[PDB]
T-cell receptor
Framework: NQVEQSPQSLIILEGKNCTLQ??????????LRWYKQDTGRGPVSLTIMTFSENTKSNGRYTATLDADTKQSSLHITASQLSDSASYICVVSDRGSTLGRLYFGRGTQLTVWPDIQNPDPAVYQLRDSKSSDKSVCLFTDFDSQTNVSQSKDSDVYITDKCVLDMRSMDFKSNSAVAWSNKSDFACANAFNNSIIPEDTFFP | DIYQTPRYLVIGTGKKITLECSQTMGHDKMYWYQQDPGMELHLIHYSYGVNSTEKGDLSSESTVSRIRTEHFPLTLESARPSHTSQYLCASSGLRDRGLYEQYFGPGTRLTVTEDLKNVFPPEVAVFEPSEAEISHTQKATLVCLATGFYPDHVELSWWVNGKEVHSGVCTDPQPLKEQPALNDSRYALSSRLRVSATFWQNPRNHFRCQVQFYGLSENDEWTQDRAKPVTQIVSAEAWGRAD
């Protein structure tokens, strides 16, 4: 592979800047691009640079190229949740039609909410009774908490999900557990998870 | 702009599949990439122009045609489950500063199933907020579950008082397999809408979880007694509770 990216992945808090690195061995070198790929979506070009430019900016994204050392960086200012995505470095060898694009494998950036007031709690969402399902919600824990799968194949547990109430200017993690069996209670739902000792069980 | 049809396709093993890609930018260079969820893009075909067709970096059973500049259709003569993934078309033209800028199409999500009788729509249920949450936090989380669907070709949204809302929403990035040890396992997806306690407690407020499911077309054959799993919206609703 003539195009290599670093890091493989990283997690940063919202508001913080980060730097992504790209290194290449492609020769001859014509140009270098950065792509942002959201999950389930096609890549979106951010900045395109030739050796005749050392800097390109696209809003909060600012890309640098040192063509001598065959290295580029992408800097993100004031990271936002929406910056969580795959970042792809692509290099083209020739300016003409017969040139080729060389893709790096990408860097996965995850941006976490800054949770100042964690209030971890497991709540039971009143039984739909239109549905045979019972639902438990683990919410308001810090992003340090990892939610585990259930030890029961008839109990479904989803991973932690960040929700942004862009008005109260409030962010919160939550995970959902459900099962249709008589066994299932919210007191046990997340037993396979390491949950904070102060977790509220109403 | 650059265009791809259909957005989603489910089809039985062995059938012929054509994926359309067109663009009116006058672009000569055009590309087909393949990508599974969470994986890297693999160039599968490219085209220099009007009558060009070259194999990409990854070998494929697919072929392509570039008879006209505007069209770059990808063909799979006999679909197999292994062809299941996302297919992204791209084009690039001469922009400025001596650059070719690559533009990607919307993509086609393709699932190849063994038998169309594997295709099921979602059942959708909304679950109302816990009174313990409301009194403890002054907030109210509704949960939506879409269950028993195949293929994984689904778009979930929340609607409040008839407007789609995005603030206060989280939908799992990926659905769960009901049966992880099975290839055509059906799926479940969860979503959360969080509002203020006073907003939930207003009985005039209407909350609706909507799941667009992409399934069989009116051209597909159906011999089952159960309803034909066509493309459809399945929804579930709740109104505010004054306590």
């Amino acid at each position: 592979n003539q195009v290599e990216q670093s890091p493989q992945s990283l997690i940063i808090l919202e508001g913080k800047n980060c730097t992504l690195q790209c290194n290449y061995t492609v020769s001859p070198f014509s140009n270098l691009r950065w792509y942002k790929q959201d999950t389930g979506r096609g890549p979106v070009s951010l900045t395109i640079m030739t050796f005749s430019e050392n800097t390109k900016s696209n809003g909060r994204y600012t890309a640098t190229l040192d063509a001598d050392t065959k290295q580029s960086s992408l800097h993100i200012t004031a990271s936002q949740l929406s910056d969580s995505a795959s970042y792809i470095c692509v290099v083209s060898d020739r300016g003409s039609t017969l040139g080729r694009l060389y893709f790096g494998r990408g860097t996965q950036l995850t941006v976490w909410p800054d949770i100042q007031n964690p209030d971890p709690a497991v709540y039971q969402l009143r039984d739909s009774k239109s549905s045979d399902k019972s639902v438990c919600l683990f919410t308001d824990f810090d992003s340090q908490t990892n939610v585990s799968q259930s030890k029961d194949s008839d109990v479904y547990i989803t991973d932690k999900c960040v929700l942004d109430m862009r008005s109260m200017d409030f962010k919160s993690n939550s995970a959902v557990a459900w099962s249709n069996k008589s066994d299932f209670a919210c007191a046990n739902a997340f037993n396979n998870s390491i949950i904070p000792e102060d977790t509220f069980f109403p | 702009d650059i265009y791809q049809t259909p957005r989603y396709l489910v089809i039985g093993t062995g059938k012929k599949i054509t994926l359309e890609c067109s663009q009116t930018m006058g672009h000569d260079k055009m590309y087909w990439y393949q990508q599974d969820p969470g994986m890297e893009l693999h160039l599968i075909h490219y085209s220099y122009g009007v009558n060009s067709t070259e194999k990409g970096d990854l070998s494929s059973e697919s072929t392509v045609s570039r008879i006209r500049t505007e069209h770059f259709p990808l063909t799979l003569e006999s679909a197999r489950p292994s062809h299941t993934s996302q297919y992204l078309c791209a084009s690039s033209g001469l922009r400025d500063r001596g650059l070719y800028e690559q533009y990607f199409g919307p993509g086609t999500r393709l699932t190849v199933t063994e038998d169309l009788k594997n295709v099921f729509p979602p059942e959708v249920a909304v679950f109302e907020p816990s009174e313990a949450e409301i009194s403890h936090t002054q907030k109210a989380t509704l949960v939506c579950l879409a269950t028993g669907f195949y293929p994984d070709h689904v778009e979930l949204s929340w609607w409040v008082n008839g407007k789609e809302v995005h603030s206060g929403v989280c939908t799992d990035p990926q659905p769960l397999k009901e049966q992880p040890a099975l290839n055509d396992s059906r799926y479940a997806l969860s979503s959360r809408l969080r509002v203020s306690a006073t907003f939930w407690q207003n009985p005039r407020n209407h909350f609706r979880c909507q799941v667009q499911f992409y399934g069989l077309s009116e051209n597909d054959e159906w011999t089952q007694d159960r309803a034909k799993p066509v493309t459809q919206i399945v929804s579930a609703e709740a109104w505010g509770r004054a306590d």
